[PDB]
Amino acid sequence: ADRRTRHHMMVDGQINPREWFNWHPKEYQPWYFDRHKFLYEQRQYAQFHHLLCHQVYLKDMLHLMRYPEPYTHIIDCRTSTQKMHRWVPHSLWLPRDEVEYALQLSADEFLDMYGFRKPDKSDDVILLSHNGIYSEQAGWEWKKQFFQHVYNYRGGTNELFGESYSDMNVSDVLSPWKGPFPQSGVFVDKWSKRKVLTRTGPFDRQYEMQDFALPDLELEK
Amino acid sequence: VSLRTIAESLGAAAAAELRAEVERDTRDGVAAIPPLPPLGWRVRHPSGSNYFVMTRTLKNGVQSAELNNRRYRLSRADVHLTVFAPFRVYDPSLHDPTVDICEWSSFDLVVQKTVPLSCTPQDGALSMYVCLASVNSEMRIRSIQLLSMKEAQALVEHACFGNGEPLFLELLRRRGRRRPLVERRFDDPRLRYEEVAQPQQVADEAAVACSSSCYGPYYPAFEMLMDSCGSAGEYSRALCYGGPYVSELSRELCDALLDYIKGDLGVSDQLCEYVCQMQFFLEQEEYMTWLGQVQHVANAVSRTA
Amino acid sequence: SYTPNLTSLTNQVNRSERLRKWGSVGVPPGFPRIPRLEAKGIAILHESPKVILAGRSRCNNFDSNQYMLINKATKRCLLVDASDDWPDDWAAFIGASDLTLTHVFLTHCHIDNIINLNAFLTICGSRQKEIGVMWCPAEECWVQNFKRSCERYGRFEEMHQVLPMMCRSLYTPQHLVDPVHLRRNDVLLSAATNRATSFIDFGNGVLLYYIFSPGHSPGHMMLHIPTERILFSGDLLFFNKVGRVDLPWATGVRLAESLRLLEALPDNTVVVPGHGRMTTLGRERRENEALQQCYQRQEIGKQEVSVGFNEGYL
Amino acid sequence: VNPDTSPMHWHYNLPQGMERPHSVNRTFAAPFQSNHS
Amino acid sequence: VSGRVYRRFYGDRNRVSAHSTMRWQHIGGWKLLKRIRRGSLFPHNVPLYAVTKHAQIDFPNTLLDTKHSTVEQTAMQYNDPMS
Amino acid sequence: PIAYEDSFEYEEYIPAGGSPLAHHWTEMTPSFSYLEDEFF
Amino acid sequence: MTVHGTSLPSTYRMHKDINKAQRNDRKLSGNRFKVL
Amino acid sequence: LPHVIYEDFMKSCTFASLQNPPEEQFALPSVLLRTLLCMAAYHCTLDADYFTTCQMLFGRMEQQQQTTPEVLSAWVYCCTASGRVDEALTYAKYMADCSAPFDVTVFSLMQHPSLNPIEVEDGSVPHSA
Amino acid sequence: DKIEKWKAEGLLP
Amino acid sequence: LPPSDFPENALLKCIEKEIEDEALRLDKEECPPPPPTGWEMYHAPGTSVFYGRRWWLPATASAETRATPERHTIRVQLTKRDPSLDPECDVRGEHFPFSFFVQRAELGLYDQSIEVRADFVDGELLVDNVVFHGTFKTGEEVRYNNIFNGYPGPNLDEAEEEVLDGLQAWLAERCVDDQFGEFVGQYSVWVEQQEYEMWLKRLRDFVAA
Amino acid sequence: CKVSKVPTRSVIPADALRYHPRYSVPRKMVLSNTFNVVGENNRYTSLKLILEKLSGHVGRRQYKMLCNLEKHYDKLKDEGIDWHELKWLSREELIVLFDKVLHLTRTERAALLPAIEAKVCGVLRQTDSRHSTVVCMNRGNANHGWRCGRNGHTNDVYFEGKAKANTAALQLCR
Amino acid sequence: QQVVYRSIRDCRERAFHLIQELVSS
Amino acid sequence: ARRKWGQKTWSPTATNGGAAPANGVSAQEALQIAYRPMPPSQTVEYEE
Amino acid sequence: AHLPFNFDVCYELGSREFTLFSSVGSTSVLVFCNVSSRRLRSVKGGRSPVVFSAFVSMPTSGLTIEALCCSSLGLLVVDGVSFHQGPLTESMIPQDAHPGPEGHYQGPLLNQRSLAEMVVNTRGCITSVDPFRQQESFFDGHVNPWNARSLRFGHVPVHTAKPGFSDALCHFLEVFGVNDELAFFVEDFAHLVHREEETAWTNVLKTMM
Ligand SMILES: [Zn+2]
Ligand SMILES: [Zn+2]
């Protein structure tokens, strides 16, 4: 119902001069649209490009279900036992939320706590999930402990069984009634606070904050 | 047939809108929890109303305050704070673009001093009514009035020469009627299970002492004057002496008064921002009830049609 | 202008602005040095029984004026700004006049004023054989960003030149060299400029009163001569303009207050700006619309009144 | 502030020798790609 | 005043009219201004497009010494002579 | 009835009448007029 | 289009669109009266 | 300490260059808030005089970021570490009333009052995994 | 649950 | 007095200093300004309203015997401003608005009276409109029984001139002009400073306990 | 005059406070030649701009307008009804158009009615550019064809600087 | 808990009823 | 103490040193300038 | 014009109000307004717009829908809707100077008409940002929005109903007779009441002088 927001961002007025360009916002337009892509192939995850694990595909999975390999192993990273209904063959369960300790466990203790021996670091590991996000996070975990061959199946259980289930949807969009830090706290100068809070437009256009602008005297002439 | 179809369509739309309203605050199965008030404050909200009242009580004068309490690394009179926060927030920058204030939220605060002296209910029941405004998350005082039973009796007797306020008196003659609304309780978790009727106990103690004291027959005028939810209350407090323009007051006096309001008395900028957040959250909550009500009326019309 | 961070590099609006502002070339041409083929000579603007004034009008491509006071009794000269692209002309001028250059009074530390300070000091000291710098300490912010403006405007030669005001003056702890550099003559002015005590004795009973007038620069200082009715404002009050506010640490409200700080001086006070033509305080009071707004808003009751220019400073 | 590392006409009395060789084509072997078929 | 006259019609609200440039150059005084010298008249009811008034002073400037210093000359210019 | 030319505002360049200079150091000086009897 | 990725008219329209919020020059509620 | 670290993180988000819309820009990860409050709780176990600045930090965090079950759980853990069992139990009962399940990571860290969350998160002390 | 509560408050007669 | 039991000593001392300054101030005048002839000025201490009353007897042509005396009353309420939006919004202009009741002869104010609402701006007073109360003949009758609302009349600035001239004469003969408005303003100033002193004293008493 | 007094008159219009970067009068660039003659190409520019401004963000906080009114611009243009003809339409024709033709949802008619009830001038104005995205918002006057009788905005004037209408030719529309 | 009533008798009987609650409480 | 927006009160100047003597400040004047009248309940006074 | 189907109008001179009512066997609808004293916006478009309230009581549902709506060009826009527990009562109706129920409002801002009017540079209700400045004429929603029921007491609801829901609500409410015909008649009657009442006031003023 388009709830009014409680942020104190405000466009500049039409009476006073523009001043204090120590901080100055502007609109920020990137090159391409990115929302259509995989979550971890977007701009804010660009730094982990070499870290994103290799992608396995539907034909490889359908081959491997029938003709399994002694060393490879599929791992289901699904968490909601209620959400997970059916079983991908030759797969071991290891939910994403506890990989941090699962991969720290010892060889004996891992078998003790999970019932299947901890794979060797030189072995091929495949990770699948609902949409691939839990599999990606689990693969990052696996890579941290120096596991050489880690893969994820991006189109996972949903593609296998035709399911339309979804993985975690925990986005940290601040609730409208919460007022962010800059408008509340007293930590910088008055004019700096005003210029930080100012935005040139509808406050959903992904503006950019730049510091220390200088006048283009040659253009002005 | 057209009436039945229209009513059923409206009912379906209301059901869908409430479904979406609840879905917005999912947070993976846990519905949004209300903002948590500061230490010791307890907030109560009449259901279906556009205001909430939050109470606090300091058994000691000010030494019970958090600022005087920290000090880490005579039995003066006890204090009672009651903050009335309605659902009125607007942007003054929209009506005239010459004002650089985005939000402006008004809320009233009454402080009453009680025996553990003209502040006691027996001696005039002098209390202070201070209006507060949140402007871009900043609490400033709009006005401070010192209201008393003497003022209440004067307003009913001698605001004018001999028969005060033909207008205030007529407002008293009408005075409407009270309609008890079921009271929802959002109180500081620490105090959420100790006492649930403390605000009623203190309100009753004050009301009975004031009524049984002098100015007894004028107590109803005092109650209407102190009414923080009615238009007659605001007009009566306007007939009273509005405090001096604080910007016209002294710089050091304003500084000391802000110190007293914030640190000593305990109502701080954290409390102000919480008041704004709760104004938002409870309006959100009441919108759900409004959707339920529209669904109810539409379904009843469809059933009777 | 500013450092090219990842956002500045991945923003398309930055490239759009670069193409539009400066055409097919994405860089600004900056302000170059005026060629010697088109440089004027120093003119004598005032002759008085006590002091005289000599200056050049368009010293930089920034159109900054250069001024020098000569005491006429102690044979002491004093440059106002180190803005002249050709300081050796002034050096020869003072050598021919047999004068002694004692101080350089930086009204404020913008590039148009400080661009040639090192060249002025080197040439003048070489001819002398120290020369002090009088500046407000509030502008260490501009002094430490002197390099950034030079890089932006293409004055690369002066880029790698430590400013003389940064060289461990008497207000700063001195070096402890091994048993196997200090500037004693420079002075730092205080923002609490009083009409009674804050001044410098130019000699022969002439007292130069400096006035703290921020808003265009955080540490802006005007100079006043309440004996020949002369006011070196500088980037504050021009013929038909006022100082800019589109700059870092530039505030319209404090600029307006600085403007109001001139409400008592006599009307026949001639103001020589840091740029442009000389005007008079009466004409500025009567025909300057920036000042007219500064006062009309105050009349109608603006509590926080801000004025300032946003297109070009002379 | 935090200092920045300093990065780097030609007179006729100078040697007029080429400053540095450039190998762009050998570094990037661009396959032939033409709009026309 | 100091003013400008253009050859072609522009009107006050729109430049559409029934007379061509060859007629308007005479109607609006462009040719008259080209022709006439310094001491002649100029019609008042034809438009002017850059009229700027020259600043005035009280004391007459005629027979005023040019050897004054530049600063006091500016002071006299702007109607506030020193002393 | 102190004349303006002989007042504190004249020495401090403060205008005779009008809005106060909110950013002038005289107004920015913290004031405690009720403690001099305890401090001096 | 190669180095900057935009055309001149495209850049002008983009400038006008990004500066739309402050380009708006409405009419103010007239008749402000002198107080001081 | 964590209370200063929180303000530093908020300043970084305020002066960042990309400046997404504020609801996306100023909301730190809930896991990050949990880790920071768990560091605060570990520090509280040592002196418990830290609890007043913990109160102030949590009072600011509540209204600056989203009040999630795991941040509430970290607050309860630091309350217990400070020694205010009554208040910790009251906050847990409020969790139960609002139907907020307790955080299992905070539960595990509760029973390990010698393992601060940053070392636990690192690949150190694996034997206690 | 919310509708049942509102029924309890009597906002939905 | 001691900080241990009175941690608000800073505020109490500041209030005492303010009271002492407000008292020792040589500008203050003990005597309220003298009202114009025939007026008795009432004011309840602690209220933001003061009243003035006088009796008057109109002239008459055609010698209609026993020109019925009238009672003139003035109600003046102290102007209020809110400083929460002070630094941003421009100053609120000073002005003294009052109401002028006239009723022909114990009956109250809003029952059988003609009220004129006027505002004394810094320079001169200006009448906004004329409100009625009671039954009136119209020269048929009209009833104004609403005390809060009613029909306060078209704003006189855009009201018809035939009525404006009659209203202006009907005021100038009653002697309601700028000289009365300036007195209203200065009496409001005095009343408001008295209320300020009372407010300081009561605040001092309340804060201490 | 030791200290000349600045000129500050006692009454000032609020519009006189509008900011200009160099505190001078902004230039007035004349509009494009396509506005020389009011044809079917340009006769709907005011409608375009008014609908765009009513559909976009509003206020200094950029409050989003939830209803998009541009989707009816194509239908109005196909009807041949420009902003001036909308102003001429009476209440009955407005009901007929909103129900039969445009199919305006009541929440959209409610947002569009403030622009018809005010009879806004709806004429392009010169503003320092060839594009001129400024349309006069003064209340209309029936004597001037529902155009404010102020500068240039008189009967049949469509664009500020170019010319009056040619209703004789406009009869060629259909 | 403000409740209006039409009979003095019906009011006093319920007042006596209320006294029992206020006493046994 | 009850200040108006436009009206100002003019006060005498103590000496020729102005509000801040640029020439210098003596030991007792500096002692007073250091021990300024702050509300003691919120001030830490410390020596070394 | 003519009255809508099945409606009876009530108006008395000097009240500056009129209320028109219609009871259907089940439902009862009563719509009330008080024409402003200030100049009214002309019906032709080229000043306070006429805004009224409509109480729709459905005994079957056990609630009453109070709809704040204003008529423009003879049409209507329903800016607010709220619900009340009881059936229609005279205390609920703001017919006299007393308001209806207080401390209840929850209307979700069905319409962005206030936002739409501010792009066409229409001044609107709030002329001064300072509330106390406008509070001089208390108990008058026309000239004191901060206590005006029809103006929401100056509050902007946090929500704005989704257009597909708002149009459905408007259509549902139009079935009970709150249609554009009702709004057209209400606006016509508002102009007639304004004119005739102003004429009576002028006659009284002329008669006294
Ligand atoms: Zn400069
Ligand atoms: Zn127009």
Nearest to N164 by CA among K107, B8, K98, K95: K107
Nearest to B118 by CA among B151, B89, B86, B141: B151
For residue B54, give the H/E element and its range: strand B51-58
Half-sphere exposure of residue C238, counting CA atoms within 13 Å on the CB side?
21
Exposed/middle/buried for N116, CB within 10 Å: 0-12, 13-18, 19+?
A: buried
CA of residue C63 to ligand 1 center, whole Å: 11
Contact F8 M8 (CB under 8 A): no
Whole-number Å distance between alpha carbons of K147 and K138: 8
Q: Please compute Rg for chain D using Cα positions.
A: 20
Cα distance between the two ends of chain H: 26
Strand extents, DSSP E, B149-278: 183-187
Whole-number Å distance between alpha carbons of J20 and J2: 21
Token pair listed for E62:
């005629």
Whole-number Å distance between alpha carbons of B194 and B208: 24
**Dihedral of CA N183/N188/N194/N200: which sign?**
negative
Q: Does F32 touch chain M (CB under 8 A)?
A: yes
Phi, psi of B56 (to 5 degrees): -145, 155
Residues in C lying within 8 Å of A, measured between beta carbons? 1-2, 7-8, 10-13, 21-22, 28-31, 62, 145, 148-149, 152-153, 244-252, 306-313
Exposed/middle/buried for C190, CB within 10 Å: 0-12, 13-18, 19+?
A: middle
Residues in N lying within 8 Å of A, measured between beta carbons? 108, 156-162, 165
The count of CB pairs under 8 A between chains B and F is 5
Residue B5 burial (CB count, 10 A): 11
| Three-class DSSP labels, J143-190 | EECCCCCCCCCCCCCCCCHHHHHHHHHHHHCCCCCHHHHHHHHHHHHH
What does the DSSP assignment read for C192-234?
Answer: ---SSS--EEEETTEEEEEEE--SSSTT-EEEEETTTTEEE--
Q: Does G26 touch chain K (CB under 8 A)?
A: yes
Say which amino acid occupies L13: E
Nearest to C111 by CA among C277, C248, C231, C279: C248
**For residue A76, what are the β-bridge partners?**
A93, A128
Nearby residues of N109 by Cβ (< 8 Å), 6 or more positions away: N79, N80, N156, N157, N159, N160, N161
Contact N10, N95 (CB under 8 A): no
Q: Do chains C and A touch, with touching meaning 3 or more CB–CB pairs less than 8 Å apart?
A: yes
Q: What does DSSP say about strands C206-212 and C221-225: parallel, antiparallel, or unpaired?
A: antiparallel
Taking CA atoms, B105 is separated from A83, G35, J203, in Å, by 45, 28, 26
Nearby residues of F33 by Cβ (< 8 Å), 6 or more positions away: B252, J17
Whole-number Å distance between alpha carbons of J187 and B257: 29
Whole-number Å distance between alpha carbons of C41 and H44: 75
Residues in B lying within 8 Å of M, measured between beta carbons? 244, 247-251, 253
Whole-number Å distance between alpha carbons of N120 and N49: 15
Taking CA atoms, B251 is separated from F30, J92, M1, in Å, by 10, 20, 8
Q: Do chains H and J touch, with touching meaning 3 or more CB–CB pairs less than 8 Å apart?
A: no
Exposed/middle/buried for M11, CB within 10 Å: 0-12, 13-18, 19+?
A: exposed
Nearest to B264 by CA among B110, B125, B79: B79
Say which amino acid occupies E36: I
Nearest to B135 by CA among B182, B169, B90: B90
What does the DSSP assignment read for C79-109?
Answer: ES----S-HHHHHHHHHHHT-EEEEEE-S--
Nearby residues of C96 by Cβ (< 8 Å), 6 or more positions away: none
Exposed/middle/buried for K78, CB within 10 Å: 0-12, 13-18, 19+?
A: exposed
Nearby residues of J161 by Cβ (< 8 Å), 6 or more positions away: none
Token pair listed for A29:
């337009």
Whole-number Å distance between alpha carbons of J39 and J53: 5
Token pair listed for K153:
């905005």
* Spacing of C-alpha A23 from chain mean position: 29
Contact B49 N103 (CB under 8 A): yes
Nearby residues of A99 by Cβ (< 8 Å), 6 or more positions away: A77, A137, A138, A141, A142
Q: Does B102 touch chain K (CB under 8 A)?
A: yes
Method of determination? cryo-EM
Whole-number Å distance between alpha carbons of N114 and N109: 10
Whole-number Å distance between alpha carbons of N134 and N148: 12
- Give the CA-trace dihedral at K50, K55, K59, K62, to 10 degrees: -140
Token pair listed for B9:
């369509």
Residue N83 burial (CB count, 10 A): 22
Nearest to N133 by CA among J83, B297, B199, B16: J83
The count of CB pairs under 8 A between chains B and M is 13
Residue M22 distance to chain J (closest CA, Å): 32
Contact B273 H101 (CB under 8 A): no
**For residue K104, what are the β-bridge partners?**
none
Residues in N closer than 8 angstroms to A3, CB to CB, are 158-159
* Spacing of C-alpha H106 from chain mean position: 9
Residues in binding site of C: 108, 110, 112, 216, 235
Contact H18, A208 (CB under 8 A): yes
Token pair listed for J60:
């008459």
CA of residue K136 to ligand 2 center, whole Å: 5
Taking CA atoms, H111 is separated from B203, C196, H114, in Å, by 45, 72, 9
Residue K23 distance to chain C (closest CA, Å): 6
Q: What does DSSP say about strands A124-128 and A149-153: parallel, antiparallel, or unpaired?
A: parallel
**For residue C244, what are the β-bridge partners?**
C309
Phi-psi region of K125 (alpha: psi -120 to 50; beta: other; left: phi over 0): beta
**For residue J41, what are the β-bridge partners?**
J52
Ligand nearest the Cα of residue K139 is 2
The maximal CA–CA distance of chain C, rounded, in angstroms, is 70
Token pair listed for B139:
């609490």
Half-sphere exposure of residue A79, counting CA atoms within 13 Å on the CB side?
14
**Nearest Cα residue in chain G from M5:** G36
Whole-number Å distance between alpha carbons of B25 and I2: 14
Whole-number Å distance between alpha carbons of B255 and B141: 12
**Residue E82, SS3?**
coil
Q: Which of residues 178-197 of C touch M (CB under 8 A)?
A: 190, 192, 194-197
Whole-number Å distance between alpha carbons of C191 and N102: 57
Whole-number Å distance between alpha carbons of B209 and B125: 9
Whole-number Å distance between alpha carbons of B60 and G18: 58
Whole-number Å distance between alpha carbons of B229 and A164: 51
Residue A14 distance to chain B (closest CA, Å): 8
Q: What does the buried/exposed string (b/e) look like for A98-127 if buried means 16 or more CB atoms within 10 Å of the residue's CB?
A: bbbbbbbbeeebbeeeeeeebbeeebbbbb
Contact C79, C65 (CB under 8 A): no
Q: What does DSSP say about strands B139-147 and C187-188: parallel, antiparallel, or unpaired?
A: unpaired
Cα distance between the two ends of chain J: 12
Whole-number Å distance between alpha carbons of M9 and K174: 77
Residues preceding chain discontinuities in chain D with C to N over 2.5 Å: 8
Q: Do chains A and N touch, with touching meaning 3 or more CB–CB pairs less than 8 Å apart?
A: yes
Contact C111, C83 (CB under 8 A): no
Residues in binding site of C for Zn(2+): 108, 110, 112, 216, 235
Taking CA atoms, C55 is separated from B146, C66, C232, H43, N52, in Å, by 67, 5, 12, 68, 75
**For residue J137, what are the β-bridge partners?**
none
Whole-number Å distance between alpha carbons of A43 and J32: 75
Taking CA atoms, K154 is separated from F24, K148, K162, N44, N178, in Å, by 53, 7, 13, 18, 39
**Residue J75, SS3?**
strand
Contact K139 N113 (CB under 8 A): no
Token pair listed for C103:
């101080």
Strand extents, DSSP E, chain K: 11-12, 157-159, 163-164
Q: Does A12 touch chain G (CB under 8 A)?
A: yes
Phi, psi of E71 (to 5 degrees): -65, -45
Contact K13, G32 (CB under 8 A): yes
Nearby residues of C306 by Cβ (< 8 Å), 6 or more positions away: A16, A17, A19, C245, C251, C252, C253, C255, C256
What does the DSSP assignment read for N72-117?
Answer: STT--EEEEEEEESS---TTTS--SSS-SS-S---------HHHHH
Contact B54, B39 (CB under 8 A): no
Helix boundaries (H) for E1-83:
21-27, 30-35, 70-77
Say which amino acid occupies J167: L
Token pair listed for K27:
């230039």
**For residue B93, what are the β-bridge partners?**
none
Whole-number Å distance between alpha carbons of B116 and B181: 32
Contact B110, B241 (CB under 8 A): no
Contact C218, C249 (CB under 8 A): yes
Contact A1 N156 (CB under 8 A): no
Q: Does I1 touch chain B (CB under 8 A)?
A: no
**Dihedral of CA B206/B209/B212/B217: which sign?**
negative
**Residue N203, SS3?**
helix
CA of residue K46 to ligand 2 center, whole Å: 11
Whole-number Å distance between alpha carbons of G3 and G17: 22
What does the DSSP assignment read for N141-162?
Answer: TTT-GGG-TTTGGG---S----
CA of residue N177 to ligand 1 center, whole Å: 70
Residue B123 distance to chain L (closest CA, Å): 28
Residue M22 burial (CB count, 10 A): 16
**Nearest Cα residue in chain C from E82:** C268
Contact B274, B38 (CB under 8 A): yes
Phi-psi region of H56 (alpha: psi -120 to 50; beta: other; left: phi over 0): alpha
Residue F24 distance to chain J (closest CA, Å): 17
CA angle B293, B294, B297 (to 5 degrees): 85
Whole-number Å distance between alpha carbons of J111 and A143: 90
Give the one of H59, H87, H98 whose C-beta lies nearest to B33's C-beta: H98
Whole-number Å distance between alpha carbons of C50 and C72: 6
Contact N125, N175 (CB under 8 A): no
Whole-number Å distance between alpha carbons of B120 and B76: 12
Say which amino acid occupies J55: W
Contact C112, C60 (CB under 8 A): yes
The count of CB pairs under 8 A between chains J and N is 99
Nearest to N67 by CA among N22, N103, N33, N18: N33
Give the one of A16, A21, A221 whose C-beta lies nearest to C248's C-beta: A21
Strand extents, DSSP E, A50-181: 54-56, 74-76, 91-93, 124-128, 149-153
Contact C108, C139 (CB under 8 A): yes
Residue C39 distance to chain E (closest CA, Å): 20
Residue G22 distance to chain N (closest CA, Å): 14
Q: What does DSSP say about strands J70-77 and J49-56: parallel, antiparallel, or unpaired?
A: antiparallel
Contact C50, C72 (CB under 8 A): yes
Whole-number Å distance between alpha carbons of G35 and G28: 19
